[PDB]
Each structure stands twice: as structure tokens, then as C-alpha cells.
Amino acid sequence: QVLPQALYLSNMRKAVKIRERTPEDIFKPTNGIIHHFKTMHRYTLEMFRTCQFCPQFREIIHKALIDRNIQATLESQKKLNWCREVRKLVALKTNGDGNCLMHATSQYMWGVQDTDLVLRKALFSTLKETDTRNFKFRWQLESLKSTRNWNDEWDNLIKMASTDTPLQYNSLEEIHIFVLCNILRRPIIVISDKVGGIYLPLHWPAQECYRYPIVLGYDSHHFVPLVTLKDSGPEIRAVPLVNFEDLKVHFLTDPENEMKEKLLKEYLMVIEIPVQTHLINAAKLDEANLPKEINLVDDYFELVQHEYKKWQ
Amino acid sequence: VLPQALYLSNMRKAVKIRERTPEDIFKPTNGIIHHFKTMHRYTLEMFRTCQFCPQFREIIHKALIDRNIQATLESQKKLNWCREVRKLVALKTNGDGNCLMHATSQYMWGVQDTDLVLRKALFSTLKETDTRNFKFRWQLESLKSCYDTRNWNDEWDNLIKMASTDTPLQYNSLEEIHIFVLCNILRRPIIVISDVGGIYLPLHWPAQECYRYPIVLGYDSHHFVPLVTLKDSGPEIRAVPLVNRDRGRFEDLKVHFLTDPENEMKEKLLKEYLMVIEIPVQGWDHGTTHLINAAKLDEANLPKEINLVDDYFELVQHEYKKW
User: Fold this and answer.
1) Interface of B with A in 84-143 (CB under 8 A)
2) For residue B15, what is the nearest residue in chain A, using CA coordinates?
3) Distance CA B20, CA B39 (A)
4) Helix or strand or coil: residue A95?
5) d(CA B215, CA B102)
6) Side-chain half-sphere exposure of A95, counting CA atoms within 13 A
7) Domain extents in chain A
8) Angle, vertex CA B204, rays to CA B201 and CA B209, nearest 5
9) Residue B197, by phi and psi: left (phi above 0), alpha (psi -120 to 50) or beta?
10) Would the CA dihedral through A118, A119, A121, A126 be positive or negative?
């Protein structure tokens, strides 16, 4: 009614500043290394506290921003926000046009979706122009564990990542998430009911990576970001790495698989969270770190507050 | 593709303005009319749409400009007939019953009156300030256009009720007397261009206390819009002609609600409350020797903090490179 249907519409100018900055941050080095983001990959969105409003109005906000359906589904399958020691994650709405992985990933860190296809076009560019040998071998090895022409199956996965029309764009498998996390130099954790698990940017030393994860959620054939709520009470800001069965760690090689637990401690910031008394591993999540210049959430909030006084 | 109104370019910024507006109103105790301390001196100017491919120039005009109402006032030789003055463009305005306020609000801030701040001020003034002089002016104007002496009082008390926000079009539409009160709340004259039309001077204030650049509205159907200047790339003078040209000769614009003594010194009053200048026109012989009066218009004076146009522009430019 009153409030606009997406964060970006709160300040369309600001939205563009972001969309313009994103392509300029991509590096594309000469020595053969994967294309990557210089700086913008370290940013992280946090949702505003919807707790302090009259529930007639709290629902008006949630209707606009939150994917109530997909959150319910992951909560009802005891996969999202089951632990009472960690802070609550909220699922944001994401355009299901075939590029939702990118939209959700883009949203996690900037608030804007991938409507300009910047992340999508980067994933494809990397697959056409960089050394894909290692990626392929990892995919063969993961695919074997789960008469076929491997080279054909691979060359098809590359074609799918393109922006060409086949849903307006092709949907993306698990190998794409793995390549995406290496372009970002930041691990990605997907929560679901085989996509679910942990994607580590193993083409980079952990010293060169941002060691807070992007947290996506997955149901139907739909991705969304699972953003934390801002700066609230005394629960720890972290995602549990066990559902106790551990989350899958995709595309490891055999030597890496032997040192799996040491790798999670390398690429993420692991902490022991206690659970009913057993202790479980969990990765620390990022505090909101978007500067005012490109912070859409702060704008939407000041807008909500004003529209709430009008409502009271 | 571009958004349908200036305000949507930066909704945060829009609110900063909407929040500032009520805090600027100074509602004095001694019976003087409520008025704006500072924000009344602001003035919007539109960005130059000249530098674009005409396939795209139309995409802009489709969004921002009220193409219909501009055509109508141009086709009746009332808007932009003089080639010595700069072009005015009509901005789109929500026709929900409060368009006078929307258009006036837009003229000076870019935002429309969606929070009813100007509307609620007009009504508050009519309920709480000295209305006696306003009423007498309205009776006197209404008489010139028998009637029972208890029926004026009823006709008046009804005009006040109409200015309220109560549902009767979602709000009641406003007569000419409301524009006159509005210009006194703003301390700034209002000029309306039509086929209502004329000049509204804030006569409850000395000219020394008023902003002497006018708000320019346009009127057709039962609809008001602001007529904003187009801003640079040309050498024409920034001003609105105070005379219309029906049938070769020049009739002056009406000056509403004057009393008889004021009516005698009408030309001295325009020079008091507006910044009048002689703009020259070619006549039937003796050179191009005839002169018409015209009021100077304001240069764009909205600071970056509350300037929505600057934001929409940076948005258009970016969406043009994409195009």
C-alpha cells in the first residue's frame, strides 16, 4: 500500500550508483587468474528490525520485503532458524526470472538485484575465457560420486551460464555457485531441504578471501538471500554448519577431503555453539558494513518510519 | 523505464522535504495569518531535455510532462506565445481534488502535497485566523459577477468546509478565494494561466515581507499544474507576460479580490509585489515599438540536500547510456 515493493525503490538514484560501481570493481587480470571483485565483495546487507511496530503494520512491511512463503518452508523443515543460540535470518524476495542465484547473491551484499546481468555475465565470461580445467575435474569427480559424454555435459553447463534465451534465462546448477564463490573470493552457504551445503573459494588462498559467507536459501527452483536482522539482542551472529549431520562441502578433491575440518576453519570464521550437551561448528556472519553512500536499507528504513508516523 | 514523477527518483529525499514543510509553518498567536518562514522562497526548474535522441526525449516527456494540458494552453495561444520569454513546461499532477495544492507544492519543492500539509494549512487558517477581510473581498468580487444577507454567510461557511480534508474526487475541489488565501499563507504571489485565471497578490502582507517571484500555475478542465521553466541553453529572458493576446490587442491579466482604492493603483501594486519588466513587441507600424509588462521569474534555488530534479537527471543520464 504505502511502502514500496523493494529496497531499491526507496532511492533509485542510490540504486544506480551501486549498479554503476559493480562493473568497475571487476578486475580481469592478465596472468590467467580468475576475474574477481577488488572490494565490493566485502559488503553485506542487514535487514532493519521489524519488531517495534503494531502487527497490522509489521505485516505491511513483511509483505513488501520478505519472502514469507520460502521462509516458512525452510523453518517448517527445521533447516532455517532452528538453533535458539544464533540470530534469526529473514528471506528477502527475489525475481524468479532464471537468474535468481545471481539476484540473491547480488542482494545479499548490495541490496540491488542483478537486473543489469553483471554477475551473470561475469560467470559466463570466466567460463569461456579462463582456465576451466580444474573446475571441470572437480565437477567430474563430484558428478561421479552421485556411457555418458563428459565433454558434452560440460560444454552444455557453460552454454547455460550465458545470457542467451533458452523463464527468460537458463537456471544454474551447483558448479555455477562454486565458480561464483571464486569470482567473489567469498564462501557461499546454501540452506535447503543436492544444492545445499558449503562452497569454498579454493582457487584462492584463504588469506586473499573474505571469510564471512553469503547465505542463500533454496526451495522449489528458487534462491533467496538469508539476511540477518540489525544489531539487536545477545544471540551470536552465526550460521550453524550442521543440520547432527554436517553440511556438504562441494567439489573438494581427495587430499582436501581428508583436511575438510581444517579447511572450514581456514575459509570461514568457525565457532563452537553449544546445543541440546553437544558442541557444533558454526560460521560467524558479517555485521552490516555498507557505507551511507551506497546503503539502500538505511533509506528504506527512514521511509518506513515516516510512513508509520503518518499511519499512527 | 524512467519513473513516472520527480519524487520517485529519490523517495528518501522526498521525505526530508515532506518532513521539513510542517516545521517551517509559523502559526502566530496575535491573529496574523499562518505562514512559511523560509521554504516559500524555493523554486523548481526542469532539466534540459534538448540534448537527447528524439526517440528518448519523448520517453522523458511521456513520464514527467502533462503533454495534454500543455498542448491545450499552447493551442489557445495562452502559454508560451511570446518568443522573447523562456518556455514553460507543465508537470503532471495528481487530480485527487487537491491539485491546487499539489501543483503549488510541486512548483517550489518538486514534491506533491500527499501529506496534506498545504491543504491542512489552508483550512487551519480559515478556522483560526481573522477571516473578516477575506470574506469582504470575496463578497465584493462575487457581487461584481440580488442575494440574501444571511445567504452570503452560508455561502462563506460552506467555502471554509470545502477547504477541509473531510471526504465529500477524494477531496473537495477549491474555488478562486482559496488561491487568494494560499498566496497569503505563502507570502508569494500566484499567477494562474487559463483559457480562475489571473494574478493573486498577498495583500495581507506588505511587499517588503513577501517573496517577489511568482508561482506559475496552469489551469484547464478542473485541473491545476505547475508551469516550471526549462533552464538554460538559450538567451531568452526568464519571465511571464502579464498580458494575454486575444485578437491582436493586449488585455491585462485579472488581478483578483482588489478593493476599489487598490483597483485605482493596480499597476503600482504589480510593481510592488512582483518584479515587473518591459518586454518589447512588434506592432502595426512606427518600428517594433510597443512594450508589454511581464513579471520576472525565479532562478532555480533549491539546494542539493532537497533537490529532487538533480537526482532524476543523474538517473535519466544513466538510463540514456544504457539505451
Assistant:
1) 115
2) A303
3) 9
4) coil
5) 12
6) 19
7) 1-312
8) 85
9) beta
10) positive
For residues A92 and A107, is the Cβ–Cβ distance under 8 A? yes
Mutation choice for B interface testing from A9, A13, A298 by most B CBs within 10 A: A13
| Closest CA–CA distance from residue B194 to any residue of chain A (Å) | 34
CB atoms within 10 A of CB A170: 19
Least CB-CB distance to B10: which of A4, A12, A20? A12
Q: Are A232 and A288 in contact (CB under 8 A)?
A: no
3-state secondary structure of B110: coil
Mode of pairing for the β-strands spanning B35-36 and B25-26: antiparallel
Active site residue B61: no
List of chain A residues whose C-beta atoms are within 8 Å of the C-beta of residue B22: none
Would you state the cell numbers that stand for residue B205, as one nine-digit string?
A: 502582507
- Judged by CB atoms closer than 8 Å, whether chains meet at A13 and B115 is answered as no
Cβ neighbours of residue A296 closer than 8 Å, sequence gap 6 or more:
A7, A8, A10, A11, A14, A15, A18, A110, A111, A112
Asked how this structure was determined, the answer is X-ray
Is B99 a known active-site residue?
yes
Burial class (CB in 10 A: 0-12, 13-18, 19+), A68: middle
Question: Nearest CA to CA, how far is A186 from chain B (Å)?
Answer: 29
User: Which residue reads 553449544 in cell numbers?
Assistant: A274
Asked if the C-beta of A22 comes within 8 angstroms of chain B's C-beta atoms, the answer is no
Among all residues of chain B, which has the CA nearest to that of A298? Answer: B12
Stated resolution in angstroms: 3.0
Instruction: Determine the residue among B12, B23, B315, B323 to mutate to test chain A binding: the one whose Cβ has the most chain A Cβ atoms within 10 Å.
Output: B12
Residue in chain B nearest A310 by alpha carbon:
B115
Q: Of the candidates B48, B46, B42, which has an alpha carbon nearest to the alpha carbon of residue B91? A: B46
Specify the 3-state DSSP secondary structure of B43: coil
Angstrom distances, CA of residue B126 to CA of A208, A264, B84, B129, B189 = 69, 71, 40, 6, 19
Q: What is the DSSP string of A259-279?
A: THHHHHHHHS-EEEEEE--EE
Beta partners for residue B249, in sequence order = B246
Q: How far is A99 from chain B (nearest CA, A)?
A: 20
The residue among A16, A298, A312 with the most chain B CBs within 10 A of its CB, best to mutate, is: A16
Query: What is the Cα–Cα distance from B323 to B70, expressed in whole angstroms?
Result: 27
* A292 interfacial to chain B (CB closer than 8 Å): no
Instruction: Give the 3-state secondary structure of A21-89.
Output: HHHHHECCCCCCCCCCECCHHHCCCCECCCCCCCHHHHHHHHHHHECHHHHHHHHHCCCCCCCCCECCE
In one letter, which amino acid is B123?
A: F
Nearest CA-CA partner of B18 in A262, A249, A310: A310
Judge residue B225's burial from the number of C-beta atoms within 10 Å of its C-beta, 0-12 exposed, 13-18 middle, 19 or more buried. buried
CA–CA separation, B292 and B252 (whole Å) = 9
